Amino acid sequence: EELEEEEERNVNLFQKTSPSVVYIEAIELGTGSGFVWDKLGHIVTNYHVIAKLATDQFGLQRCKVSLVDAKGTRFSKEGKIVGLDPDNDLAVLKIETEGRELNPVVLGTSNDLRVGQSCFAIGNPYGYENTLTIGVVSGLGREIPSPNGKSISEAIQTDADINSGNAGGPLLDSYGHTIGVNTATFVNFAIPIDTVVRTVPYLIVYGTA
Amino acid sequence: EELEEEEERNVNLFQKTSPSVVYIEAIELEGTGSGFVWDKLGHIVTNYHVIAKLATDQFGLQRCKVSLVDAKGTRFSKEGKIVGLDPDNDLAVLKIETEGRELNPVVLGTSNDLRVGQSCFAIGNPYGYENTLTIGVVSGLGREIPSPNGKSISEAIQTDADINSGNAGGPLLDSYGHTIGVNTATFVNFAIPIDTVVRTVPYLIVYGTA
Amino acid sequence: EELEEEEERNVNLFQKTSPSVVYIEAIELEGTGSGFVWDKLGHIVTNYHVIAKLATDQFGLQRCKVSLVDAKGTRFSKEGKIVGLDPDNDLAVLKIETEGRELNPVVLGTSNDLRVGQSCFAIGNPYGYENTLTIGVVSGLGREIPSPNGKSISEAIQTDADINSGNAGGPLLDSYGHTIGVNTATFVNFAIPIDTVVRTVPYLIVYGTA
Ligand SMILES: [Ca+2]
Ligand SMILES: [Ca+2]
Ligand SMILES: [Ca+2]
Ligand SMILES: [Ca+2]
Ligand SMILES: [Ca+2]
């Protein structure tokens, strides 16, 4: 492109990662983002994003997930809760792929981050297009033994604008790897990808951390 | 300069484009805003909201002062007269008398070939004194809205360059220094795509409406 | 590193300048702020607003704790005493007892040759634990104000690097790691230009006032 090198990396990073980002609507008969964990149809998001569906339930609460498959085709499916972890603000959902091929994130690591490197936050703000915000890693939080709801252990602080429009979506590094999960239930913060890598396999298999 | 390459680009872009930026004061005999020079005749583009009371209320008192800079670098000010309005797309055109002054028109770019991730530069004139620069990326390219009506932009450019009152109505630029949109604030920040402006402004000038 | 050149400069700038940054707690026997190490003797520069109650209220209980890091990397804390105040330019100087600790003073730069569009880096210590980094550009270079008086900065540096309570009183830096300003928040973000601090701080130290 006739774009600068940095613009080129940004543009490419978005083209290759936004197909992993999903849009989540909490309907009552609350909106958020999430991302594709695997080809089976597991979706990671924030607990706050699906808080009513998981607690109120009451029978009426449903969960619609919109995304894109490997061909580029927008589509939508009912999302079922597989596991919750409100302590780390994590939740896993499962959709039925039904032969659709998904685009899983590429997991990175959060223990070797350095304050000053680029970070990229992607969300799906209104159900239509995905959105990109860019900043740096501003801070690497301290270890919090019992996080309890409103406190992230090892939180990644960033100055990439993070709001409701992209909470639950991935925080990426300059290689396009996912190093965190955007939150907003609480100057912006992500849950480190290392906490998610330790926890998500237990939510899938046991249904709790 | 001993500045990094990126700083150098930013510094030059601002030097070569800020002279196109104007400051707009809605006086009652309140509300301030930015706009930019469209051509050497003295046409100025801004937001409709920026000149809303002057255009709707009128009443008699409402005047319109425009401050800017000529090609020599000399600051100066003039009365601004409404030429056309397009509240649907949040656009307005004003006319000032140059009287032998040479202005610095923007360089129009295009907005249908933008890509999420490229750089954008928002320039305004926030308090009547110096121009201001904010830098971000194109965060989103909005969907088509056939009948925008007031508080909705068709093909809105979303950016994370900080956009406020201090620079509404001023230009959003790309890395070549071309204008690709118009900063709005009436509605996470949004610009009206320069393509909508390129189709609409010639009609505001010639007919006085879209 | 496998980091891009720009990330590399950012990462290094932070590593080499965050040890100069200090955390300031106004304890009543509240209000927190940042500041930075001016010299090896133990002088600390910050905002006046940050230590306002300790300087005006006093009463008796008001104390001032300062946390920082020595040249070996060891975190440590000390009582901080007011040396001089300058509320007109929102400046204050504090002194601590090093008692054989080696400190890390900022490297002073200049603010008169700044250009809108160059990079700037704001650093603070927001909750007493780690230091934070925010990155932007110089957005504006303010006009001269002969009598600033409280809520108005002469030659203010405007930036779009995020500036809040968590880093007020801390340094604003350029791409070389030099300090070009002091973050404020008592008043779109603003820093007090380092040139005003370079003229004023020697008087606060020696005479106790500007
Ligand atoms: Ca290129
Ligand atoms: Ca950059
Ligand atoms: Ca911001
Ligand atoms: Ca250079
Ligand atoms: Ca490298």
Numbering used by the authors:
A (entry chain C): 82 to 110, 129 to 285, 296 to 318
B (entry chain B), C (entry chain A): 82 to 110, 128 to 285, 296 to 318
What does the primary publication say about this deposited structure?
Plant Deg5 and Deg8 are two members of the HtrA proteases, a family of oligomeric serine endopeptidases that are involved in a variety of protein quality-control processes. These two HtrA proteases are located in the thylakoid lumen and participate in high-light stress responses by collaborating with other chloroplast proteins. Deg5 and Deg8 degrade photodamaged D1 protein of the photosystem II reaction centre, allowing its in situ replacement.
Deg5 is a distinct HtrA protease that is naturally devoid of a PDZ domain. His147, Asp188 and Ser266 constitute the catalytic triad of Deg5. To avoid self-degradation of wild-type Deg5 during crystallization, Ser266 was mutated to alanine. The trimer has a shallow funnel shape and the catalytic triad is located on the concave side of the funnel. Five Ca2+ ions are observed per trimer. Deg5 (S266A) shows an inactive state in which a novel conformation of the catalytic His147 was observed and Thr284 on loop L2 interacts with His147 and blocks substrate entry. The χ1 angle of His147 in the alternative conformation is rotated anti­clockwise by ∼120°, preventing formation of the His147–Asp188 hydrogen bond, which is an unusual conformation compared with other distorted HtrA catalytic triads. The missing electron density for loops including L2, together with the distorted His147, indicates that the Deg5 structure shown here is of an inactive form.
